[PDB]
């Protein structure tokens, strides 16, 4: 017979709550009832409550099983995750919503929240999209989980309530690869190196395909050294992106004293009100200081509190800056502008700025 392969994921229709399967594509309206609770009303008249909780993304299989027991008790054995790694249950009996919230909170320690409401114009801060850091990745400049935890411990109140005037995503990339929509977040934390690689010639000879390692460098700082069958770095051209070490074990550039994070702001994915936008560096570097990263967390909070105190309803960070200008932005956030922030990544073509990176256009 042979081992089965190429069978794909289980078909989702078989894993839907009966009420959701029945009303599929036949919804009238949703209504955010309270933080963490969205009421969905079907054309049939069915009403379902989607109850959302924050998770640490990394889960013990024992947590998943506890969440299973809970979903069997309140959600008829059905549940989902969201695209920011919150977990949602489906409740038909409104009188059970609060029983579910309290049981989740007690059994697994996950908070109800992560929602927002454009109608009233009051927004929660949702989960932080982040990746592996030191838990599993060989190329990080910073940890991911430790920072997410330190940042959410500080901004927790914004997750459980709708206190912000507009949408704010915070996202974390443990190195310049991103592994996420970190490059288009209202506030982005990005691991960076500040030191060049030092070629290990032996490891390069044994393990690195040279022309492709060379072609990976965005600034052309790498050349083959044919004499010694290795690679040479022009340190004056290198900006410590890390891509040559992705390609080649013989090119490490980690310095635990000088690796840390840049803070970027003003990205936007959705089209509402204003076109999408890539985030922009406003703090060049902050060190790694585990377990709590106080310097990093201090700047993230400072930027979020300044925007939140001055933004109009619906006015996301980039929209706030559209209004006031970067001059006043730097003033109100208490941030310094330095030459580091003036873009010099030469390879990107200007013609990209003339392409429509948006679904907004007229028919």
């Amino acid at each position: 017979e042979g081992v089965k392969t190429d069978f794909g994921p289980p078909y989702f229709r078989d894993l839907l709550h009966p009420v959701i399967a029945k009303n599929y594509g036949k919804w009238k309206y949703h209504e955010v009832v309270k933080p963490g609770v969205i009421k969905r009303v079907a054309e049939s008249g069915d009403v379902i409550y989607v109850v959302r909780f924050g998770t640490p993304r990394l889960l013990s299989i024992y947590t998943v099983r506890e969440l299973c027991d809970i979903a069997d008790k309140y959600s008829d054995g059905y549940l989902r995750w969201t695209s920011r790694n919150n977990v949602e249950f489906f409740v038909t009996d409104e009188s059970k919503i609060d029983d579910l919230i309290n049981e989740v909170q007690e059994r697994v320690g996950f908070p109800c929240g992560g929602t927002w409401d454009a109608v009233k114009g009051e927004y929660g801060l949702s989960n932080i999209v982040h990746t592996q850091g030191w838990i599993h990745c060989h190329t990080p400049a910073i940890d991911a989980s430790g920072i997410v935890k330190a940042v959410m411990d500080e901004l927790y109140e914004y997750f459980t309530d709708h206190k912000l005037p507009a949408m704010c995503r915070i996202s974390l990339a443990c190195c310049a690869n991103m592994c996420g929509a970190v490059h288009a977040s209202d506030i982005a934390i990005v691991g960076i190196h500040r030191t060049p690689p030092i070629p290990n010639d032996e490891a390069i000879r044994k393990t690195c395909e040279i022309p492709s390692t060379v072609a990976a460098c965005p600034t052309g700082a790498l050349k083959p050294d044919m004499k010694n069958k290795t690679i040479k770095v022009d340190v004056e051209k290198c900006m410590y992106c890390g891509n040559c070490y992705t390609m080649c074990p013989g090119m490490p550039l980690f310095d635990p004293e000088n690796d840390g994070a840049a803070i970027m702001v003003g990205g936007k994915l959705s089209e509402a009100r204003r076109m999408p936008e890539l985030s922009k560096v406003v703090v060049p570097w902050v060190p790694n200081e585990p377990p709590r990263w106080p310097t990093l967390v201090k700047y993230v909070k400072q930027i979020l509190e300044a925007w939140a105190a001055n933004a109009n309803k619906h006015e996301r960070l980039i929209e706030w800056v559209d209004r006031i200008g970067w001059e006043r932005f730097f003033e109100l956030t208490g941030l310094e502008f330095t030459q580091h922030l003036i873009d010099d990544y030469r390879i990107t073509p200007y013609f990209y700025s003339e392409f429509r990176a948006s679904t907004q256009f007229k028919w």
Binding site: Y24, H30, S83, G109, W134, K149, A150, D153, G180
Partner: protein, 417 residues
Amino acid sequence: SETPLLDELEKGPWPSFVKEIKKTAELMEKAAAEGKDVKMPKGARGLLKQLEISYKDKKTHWKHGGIVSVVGYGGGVIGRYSDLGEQIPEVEHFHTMRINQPSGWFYSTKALRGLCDVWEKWGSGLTNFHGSTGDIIFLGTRSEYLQPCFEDLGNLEIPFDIGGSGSDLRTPSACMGPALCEFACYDTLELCYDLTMTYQDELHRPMWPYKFKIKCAGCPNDCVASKARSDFAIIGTWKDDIKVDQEAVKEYASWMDIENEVVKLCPTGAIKWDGKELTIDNRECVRCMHCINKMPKALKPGDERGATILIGGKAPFVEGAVIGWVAVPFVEVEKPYDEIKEILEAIWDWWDEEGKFRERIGELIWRKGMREFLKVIGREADVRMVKAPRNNPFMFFEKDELKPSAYTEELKKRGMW
């Protein structure tokens, strides 16, 4: 404590990933102590100890991994090796397996219990729900367990296949779409599923110059962040009038400041409100979603629904971060999705023939030009593809666009034609 630095991150109100790691360690060890069939009971404790040393050193303790896989696949398992293998043998090999998620991350409890049972037997017990591309992550097992773990996965009542990695089609993802959302413009979950199954071979067996990612969003809100983190972002849209329930507008008008929170915020001034009637000039609407988001009981997307295709989305390397740009202003999204599949297959044949090692599709299009791209997918240039026409006169002309002349004859004569 053996873990004084990580113990700090058990304090604070946000649920702690450290408690997740320790809960796994305690209960995997107890399972094994109980005589349960658990292959790696020390795996989660090893990971904890490695991480504690990493917190002290402020650096990763992982090195480049071996190349590892299940029999029959070249993608979906990523080898990872610890530099502390001698001090912590239990994480010397600690690979991840990406497990394809159901579309929109809908699960039943039986599906999830089957996943827990198999991972408890074969790996560390740690998981991520979910990896950023969408997959479930099974975090940490050994080379010898990958195949038997995959065999068990396939033998479950609700079985799960491996997802993508490497230079393949990665696992496609989808927002919840019409399962829950009244704004959805097509069936994101069904499209996602169908793509995944159609292109199983492309996903399991990497054959391309680099990775290729597809994500499906039900409307322009883009709740899967398709335009930034897929190469091929399928984003719901419509071609006709926004649907207006005038009576419901009047209800919103009784409490909501429509003038300031709706009228003034429309990017094109398409929507007006005079206290008695809402008017939307749909030739001016750019379908940003804002008014609908604000007034979901009163306004809905139009009836002529489909998707806009955005091409090129990617992280920075090598040539710069890309939010995808307009490739197809409108395509219908109707099973078995032949028009989408035709565009995908044309792109992939071209990219595979012309692409360099580790060149993403958006980079290739930057290199060869929009004209060649459009010819590959058989579409005409459209003003909606740009924010502005070019700011310089350095245009290429097709040789058939030139007027016949002595000069063009000279080019022909020399074989420069």
